[PDB]
Amino acid sequence: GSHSMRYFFTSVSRPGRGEPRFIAVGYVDDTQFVRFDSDAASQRMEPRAPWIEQEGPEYWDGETRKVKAHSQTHRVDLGTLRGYYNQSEAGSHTVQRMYGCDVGSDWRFLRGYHQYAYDGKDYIALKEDLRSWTAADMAAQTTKHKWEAAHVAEQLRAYLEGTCVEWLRRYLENGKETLQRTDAPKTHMTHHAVSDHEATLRCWALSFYPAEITLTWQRDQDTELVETRPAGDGTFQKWAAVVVPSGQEQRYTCHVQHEGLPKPLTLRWEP
Amino acid sequence: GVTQTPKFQVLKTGQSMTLQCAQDMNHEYMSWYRQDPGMGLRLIHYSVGAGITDKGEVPNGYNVSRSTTEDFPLRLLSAAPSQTSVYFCASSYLNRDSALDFGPGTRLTVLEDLKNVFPPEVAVFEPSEAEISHTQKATLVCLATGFYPDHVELSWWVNGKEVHSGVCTDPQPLKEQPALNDSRYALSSRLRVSATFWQDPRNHFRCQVQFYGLSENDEWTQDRAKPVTQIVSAEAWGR
Amino acid sequence: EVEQNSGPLSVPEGAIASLNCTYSDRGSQSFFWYRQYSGKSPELIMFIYSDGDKEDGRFTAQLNRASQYVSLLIRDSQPSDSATYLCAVKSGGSYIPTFGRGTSLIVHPYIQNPDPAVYQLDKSVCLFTDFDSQTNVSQSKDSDVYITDKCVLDMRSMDFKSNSAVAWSNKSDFACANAFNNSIIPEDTFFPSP
């Protein structure tokens, strides 16, 4: 079906402790495959999946060099952004960058992304046309005019429509049995009393990939829903709960939608 | 911009030295080139940012380090005569269209023995009377002679101010003994002004040659004076 | 990878200087022209990435991706344009720009009223000056006589260029009449008798 490749970069300043922290992670869909950490021993882009390890030394030297170049840009950006907002040297600040590309069922380019944040807020982002910038405040409009002048959008659009899609297709063919799988959720319901007059019905989804999933209740209000969470073995988990008057649990149903399921499931508990 | 020190250097074979290169423009990319007569610019080492260095075309005999954004020093481990060259530091941003910004450069000469190092004798020769009447102009020539290695900067100074208008200096010097391998050099320069300016005796013309040779660091056991880095000037007044 | 003829290339003052540079990698993205004066650092003139012409004052960069070359045209060339012109190419698989060896350009000045003359100024010095730009000064026959190549000076305030060549020797055989015998001097060159 539809696929994607994303890179996530986190850059954090450390006042009076020298070098800033730089962390970079690469995903294909919901599977992490590479990482870099400035605090790690290696100072190399490291593998985080079996299928990526078959890439030769040339790939690893290239990505390492590229990620070290990202960190240098980011190191400067922290100082530049400090100037724009007129902030002190003694405070820690965070920069984040996400970029990547989507592909459809036919593995052709669908969409591309390049977003940039400062202290957890939108700073500047590339629009869906890939020729144009949304600036979030006056400081980012300075960056907008600078990036328009240096033809940044054009250079990004070349990467996003070309290199990004070619390497995504390559990774999808190398890690075929990992990335092109679809594990359906294994589901069950638990019941617990909370009162003489009330009772909790919890609905579980376990061992599913990818993470996109919908759990909803139906009757024929007080609904709890946890954030989808990693099992730690590649698959994901989620539960949804409702507090229901006891003696009326039979009229409530849990509904599960997921691409691994050929049709969506309906779960019912009865006393 | 990009600064590098020193601008000139003499070393004896086997000595170590570090060429400094610093930039204040937050360039991510930094490189070291050598430039030799027949071969153009050749890459020694580069660095796309702090904590990474990479080899270029001719890395052997050289080391680099990039522990900061600004500085990218080049170390010569054991100086060889074949490392005699002009060394340029070049840095840039990482946009597609980013161009290199080059430092002033470092002329290095590596010798087997420092006994061939000599400073220049400098002399100003005053204009011809015949030129003055024939063209209403006055050409002073300055000769800088007997110096080695080819590490000189010639400049003309009129009434305490440096002048570039009406000045010609030779692009390369002449070898005084062209057959001999370690031959001492000669250089010439012209300063042309009108006869009105020359014949006024208030005006004062100075030819200045900055020579770069040995420092106090180096040893000297010869009978002649230590051929140190020095400014040698010759003077003239109007008539 | 990136090829450039070394020259020297001679152009008369006022004429168009045409510098060329080929490249083998079709994946080349941006193309640069640097100018290096003798004994100075290379300095950027201009860059070009899109196919066609790009004008900036007297300079025009021209890129042709089909024939794989970059050009630099210099309209109304002046003697101060005399320098080595370095072509550099950035490409897809590296941060290192690929340099050509550089092309040396000399722009000979237009002397309005040639007044070829040889004047006399340990050692005596003879000055061959005011001569035409088509005159080539030759090196000495004798080794005790030293002769510099022709040199272009520019008296800014009066807009007057001038070629000159110096010669000297400590030998008492040497006189200013002898100095430039090996050079093809102009026929009506002035030789005063002080």
Partner: peptide, 9 residues
């Protein structure tokens, strides 16, 4: 594979 050409803010 990562981006190559990066421009500062």
């Amino acid at each position: 594979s990562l981006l190559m050409w990066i421009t500062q803010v």
